[PDB]
């Protein structure tokens, strides 16, 4: 249990801010603020993490979702991050993500972006 | 608002069962039961959806996460689905997903599977 | 060796046409014509396939690339398909793909689409 | 045209070596040696790149495939890298990749890994 290790404020390589609380039972709750794209201010996030990881030096699997609707903007889109927490002096969350736009059927082939974000506790 | 359209039981092409409730504010909550892999019985899911989609025939963006720990098994892994709800007589949720395993650093290159699931309200 | 099984004309769910020759040594060469996007007429493709697959009922791994430049248009982008050939009366090539646009550094986060195409020998 | 910029030896973060020649017409040809996985020595690669990129500071889209069969080993799998070349004093190729294994139909859900590699001209 990395409940303590995961809870807090994280920053990615784009300068986005991910604020999360890890629950004892596996829940992730918080807010996400993107430095890029059709986004302003904070958005609700929720997700899950493995609350009883392997003790063999493996990371801790987790994921979360943001739907890009808040009181300011609606980008008609959602991102999910899937990744792992790695603890220690340079803790990180290493993720891959999928961002789906709501599209017509004709445009569904071009609905989903993929990328990768690495989160740290500094900067 | 597809709060009503999205809430309920869905089935994918693998025979997995996704039971979800859509909240007015954008929340998704429920359970997931995989027909395949290192899984048994139900797992908690959470996610988000666009509660005010475009009215131009576009789908409704959404996503959710399952961490593959329950009272029965722990697969030290998490899947996120990112996709869109499309309503009407043959409603569907069309997704792409990322499944991350907790791994050592040496094995992190091989940590993440990607695939695609389509959910329907029958079968 | 599925040199014979793979060589020929294939069609995907979008109505795109993939014309390929499989070489004895593993090469794939041909042309691709997309039914969608910033594309017209045929584009060169090249790729590779496993020329000595497992004999246990497994599929045949393969992949190919199209850069979306031809004499007609230049979409400053490239798609790679990664997948497997499955032979028999309803032969198919089942793929996932990544389409990268050339972007500025500022826009690199939004450079890559992901999707999935299934190719058949009819329609 | 980055025919000159792209041709040569590149190294990724895993310590893999990618040796490529860029043709005037868009072709990529060469060899790949993975530092990790079920691989030994060099494998043939082929791919494509945009031979007439935008002149607005954008990168150069490209992709390539390796099928993991050579005289030494056959991993019954293929990787495709999709990405962009960015030139200048710290030139890089930034990619996302999909590695498909040949699988039975029952196991096709777990056939494809996704990841990201960054290639540089040093180390």
Q: Which of B14, B37, B110 sits opposite D113 (nearest CB)?
A: B110
Q: Which residues of A touch D114 (CB under 8 A)?
A: 96, 114
Find, in chain C, the residue whose alpha carbon is nearest to that of B113. C96
User: A112, C115: Cβ pair inside 8 Å?
Assistant: yes
The reported resolution of this PDB entry, expressed in Å, is 1.4
Report d(CA D5, CA B104) in Å as an integer: 35
D79 touches chain C (CB under 8 A): yes
Q: Which of B75, B109, B112, B116 to mutate to test the interface with D (most CBs of D within 10 A)?
A: B109
Q: Which CATH class is domain C1-123?
A: mainly beta
Dihedral over alpha carbons A83, A33, A28, B105 (to 10 degrees): 20
D115 touches chain A (CB under 8 A): yes
Eight-class DSSP state of D103: -
**Please, are residues C84 and C93 in contact by the beta-carbon 8 Å criterion?**
yes
Element containing residue B30 per DSSP (H, E): strand B27-33
Dihedral over alpha carbons B12, C91, B98, D86 (to 10 degrees): -150
D61 touches chain C (CB under 8 A): yes
**Please, are residues D68 and D52 in contact by the beta-carbon 8 Å criterion?**
no
Helix (H, G, I), strand (E, B) or coil at B40: coil
Report d(CA C21, CA C4) in Å as an integer: 9
**Please, are residues A47 and B65 in contact by the beta-carbon 8 Å criterion?**
yes
Q: How many CA atoms lie within 13 A of A107 on its CB side?
A: 12
Exposed/middle/buried for residue C36 (C-beta within 10 Å: 0-12, 13-18, 19+)? middle
**Please, are residues A57 and B39 in contact by the beta-carbon 8 Å criterion?**
no
Helix (H, G, I), strand (E, B) or coil at A32: strand
Q: Which residues of A touch C109 (CB under 8 A)?
A: 14, 36-37, 115
Q: Which residues of B touch D14 (CB under 8 A)?
A: 109
Exposed/middle/buried for residue C91 (C-beta within 10 Å: 0-12, 13-18, 19+)? middle
User: D79, C77: Cβ pair inside 8 Å?
Assistant: no
Q: Which of D36, D109, D115 sits opposite B112 (nearest CB)?
A: D115
C53 touches chain D (CB under 8 A): yes
- Helices marked H in B10-99: none
User: A49, B77: Cβ pair inside 8 Å?
Assistant: no
Instruction: Give how far the C-alpha of residue B96 lies from the chain's centroid of Cα atoms, to the nearest Å.
Output: 9
User: B61, A46: Cβ pair inside 8 Å?
Assistant: no
Q: Which residues of D touch C64 (CB under 8 A)?
A: 65, 80
Q: How was this structure determined?
A: X-ray
Residue ranges per domain, chain C?
1-123
Find, in chain A, the residue whose alpha carbon is nearest to that of B68. A50
C35 touches chain D (CB under 8 A): no
Token look-up 């990168």 returns D59
């Amino acid at each position: 249990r990395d409940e303590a290790g995961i809870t807090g404020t994280w920053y990615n390589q784009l300068g986005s801010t991910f604020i999360v609380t890890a629950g004892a039972d596996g829940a992730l709750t918080g807010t996400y603020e993107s430095a890029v794209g059709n986004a302003e201010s904070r958005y609700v996030l929720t997700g899950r993490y493995d609350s009883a990881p392997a003790t063999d030096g493996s990371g801790t699997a987790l994921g979360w979702t943001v739907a890009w609707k808040n009181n300011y903007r609606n980008a008609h889109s959602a991102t999910t991050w899937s990744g792992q927490y790695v603890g220690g002096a340079e803790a990180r969350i290493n993720t891959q993500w999928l961002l789906t736009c709501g599209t017509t059927e004709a445009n569904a082939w071009k609905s989903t972006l993929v990328g990768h974000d690495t989160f740290t506790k500094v900067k």
